[PDB]
Amino acid sequence: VLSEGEWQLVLHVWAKVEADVAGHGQDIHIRLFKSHPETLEKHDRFKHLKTEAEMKASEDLKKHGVTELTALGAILKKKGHHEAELKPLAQSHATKHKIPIKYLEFESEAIIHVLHSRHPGDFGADAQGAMNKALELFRKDIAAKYKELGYQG
Ligand code: HEM
Ligand SMILES: [Fe+2]
């Protein structure tokens, strides 16, 4: 369980994300797609963007990142009481997009790296530790939802 203070650290750096959701989403995908090229294949519809500049210039990829980040933020704000919006997410990612939990750990690494690069003064050790906890709680719970629908994560 996260303590109240850890949820507050998570939501404090999240307010900084919400200052530029589109830019954060672009930077998280570029980082994810550079670190773990297998993960850009899964995003088959962006599979052909070759450079960071092309990635930034994609309004489609830009909107996609805002959609994912908006969904994650709504989850984080529930501070763990998030079953209701995990269910539709798990169903689409399990049965449609086919995303293993290790891809989710890859994306969490990219989130933590982008949040650190962009807001170090608002994202130090206690905060990164609280965000790692939040995202692993998200991974744990959705892994469970995966199983409930069949097919492992
Ligand atoms: C914080 C974790 C994530 C959240 C909250 C997020 C959420 C979303 C949402 C809300 C959508 C739009 C509706 C959908 O089709 O169900 C979406 C689509 C998608 N997501 Fe995720 N996602 C996450 C991580 C990932 C990861 C790790 C991958 C693959 C490495 C991924 C791949 C996809 C793909 C391929 C689609 C469809 C994109 C298309 O429309 O071109 N998702 N995701
Ligand atoms: Fe994505």
Domain that holds residue 5: 1-153
Say which residue the tokens 């982008």 belong to: 114
90 lines ligand 1 (CB under 6 A): no
Resolution of this model in Å is 1.6
72 lines ligand 1 (CB under 6 A): yes
Neighbours of ion ligand 2 (CB under 5 A): 68
**What is the residue-wise DSSP string for 55-102?**
HHH-HHHHHHHHHHHHHHHHHHTTTT--HHHHHHHHHHIIIII---HH
Residue 132 maps to which CATH number?
A: 1.10.490.10
**Atom 22 (ligand 1) nearest CA:** 68
Residue 66: exposure state from Cβ atoms within 10 A (0-12, 13-18, ≥19): middle
> Distance between CA 89 and CA 99 in Å, rounded?
11
Is residue 15 within 8 A of residue 47, CB to CB? The reply is no
Nearest to 80 by CA among 130, 151, 12, 149: 130
Measured from the Cβ of residue 4, the count of other Cβ atoms closer than 10 Å reads 7
Task: Dig out the tokens for 123 from the structure.
Answer: 């994202």
Say which residue the tokens 């995908």 belong to: 29
Q: Residue 133 phi/psi, 5° resolution?
A: -60, -45
* Measured distance between the N- and C-terminal CA atoms of the chain, rounded to whole angstroms: 22
Say which residue the tokens 């069949």 belong to: 150
42 lines ligand 1 (CB under 6 A): yes
**Non-local CB neighbours of 65 within 8 Å, separated by 6+ positions:** 21, 22, 24, 25, 26, 28, 29
How many domains is the chain built from?
1
